[model samples]
Target: TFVALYDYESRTETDLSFKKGERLQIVNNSEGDWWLAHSLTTGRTGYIPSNYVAPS
Candidate 1:
């Protein structure tokens, strides 16, 4: 699990939107700038910017 260090607004349907201070379980970050994550608040999964989150 990691903490969202900033608020991220999704620009696409496949992107993930999370508020600052939210906790997300990292699924995968093997690609480019985006990372696959699971949101505990919405019980959904999507991609977010890797720079927006940090180890908790």
Candidate 2:
């Protein structure tokens, strides 16, 4: 699991939000600054800022 470095809010259906300290599974990192991630807690998938997370 990766860690959420900061909180985020979804601005669209393709965006996602997670609180600080939330765990996320990275689905892909081919987008450079924006990466795809999966939220196990909410069962959601969307793009999150690459800078917002780091490997656990």
Candidate 3:
């Protein structure tokens, strides 16, 4: 349960917070992990599980 980010920087691969339209942001781009997302609440950036988000 990670989010999409710039160049790939997921928060946690085992994230439990599952939402339909949740937002996230990027943090790092050195691991080729572009799963980070943007938080709509704090406007911050992080990563969520890839399984939680998909191509809509």
Candidate 4:
């Protein structure tokens, strides 16, 4: 297994409200190569860039 880190934003971009080290999980309906993740705190789910995450 491995640990995954989330990039809150890119060098050219920033999401002000997100904190580093926030926990998340992949959603059920996410298709191949695509994923939906929710903020464990906020329960808000959205599509994240595939390249922004890694798996164990």
Candidate 5:
């Protein structure tokens, strides 16, 4: 799990767009730098940069 440090508007279809205050659970953080983030601000799984979130 993690927290968004700042708002991330999805720049690509594969990216996760989340509010800074929302909680983020990682579905796949092992793939690479763009970890797979899980939530239903979108329903479908999306990727977020490793730096955009914090460990929680």
Candidate 6:
């Protein structure tokens, strides 16, 4: 699991909205700049920037 560094509000329809400090599980970190993640708080899977999170 990883913790969010900032409040990430996805501008695209395919992305997700996550609060700062929220815990997220990385689905695929090797994909690219936008990492695939699933929200531990809501179980909503979507894309987020790897720089926005810190791994546990």
The whole-model lDDT of each prediction reads 0.84, 0.83, 0.58, 0.56, 0.78, 0.83
Worst 10 residues of 5 by lDDT: 26-35
In model 2, pairs of residues that clash are none
Residue range 1-56, candidate 2, lDDT tens digits: 79999999998887678899999987766545876799888999987887777888
Ranking by lDDT: 1, 6, 2, 5, 3, 4
- List residue ranges in candidate 6 displaced over 4 A: 29-56
Candidate 5 residue lDDT tens string, 1-56: 89889999998787789988899887855544777789657687766777777777
Q: After superposition, how far is residue 3 of candidate 1 from its true place, in Å?
A: 0.2
Q: Which of candidates 3 and 4 is the stronger one according to lDDT?
A: 3
Specify the poorest-scoring 10-residue window by lDDT in model 3. Answer: 1-10
TM-score, cand. 4: 0.29
Better of 3 and 6 by lDDT: 6
Candidate 1 residue 14 Cα shift, in angstroms, is: 0.5
**Global lDDT of model 5:** 0.78
Largest lDDT belongs to which candidate? 1
CA RMSD per model (angstroms): 13.9, 13.6, 15.2, 13.7, 13.1, 13.7
Q: Would you estimate the TM-scores of all the predictions?
A: 0.48, 0.46, 0.28, 0.29, 0.49, 0.46
In terms of TM-score, the best-performing candidate is 5
Candidate 6, position 56, lDDT: 82
Give the distance in Å from residue 15's predicted Cα in candidate 3 to where it truly belongs. Answer: 13
Evaluated against the true structure, the overall lDDT of model 6 is 0.83
Model 4 misplacement above 4 A: 1-32
**Selected candidate, larger TM-score, 3 vs 6:** 6
| Tens digits of per-residue lDDT for model 6, 1-56 | 99989998899786789999999996765544877799998989987877788878
| Candidate 4: tens digits of C-alpha lDDT, residues 1-53 | 22336545444343233455666564455334546787677989987766667
Which stretches of model 1 miss by more than 4 angstroms?
28-56
Give lDDT tens digits, candidate 3, residues 1-56. Answer: 34534343346675435454556664654345447788777999976666566665
Question: Deviation in angstroms for 8 in model 4?
Answer: 31
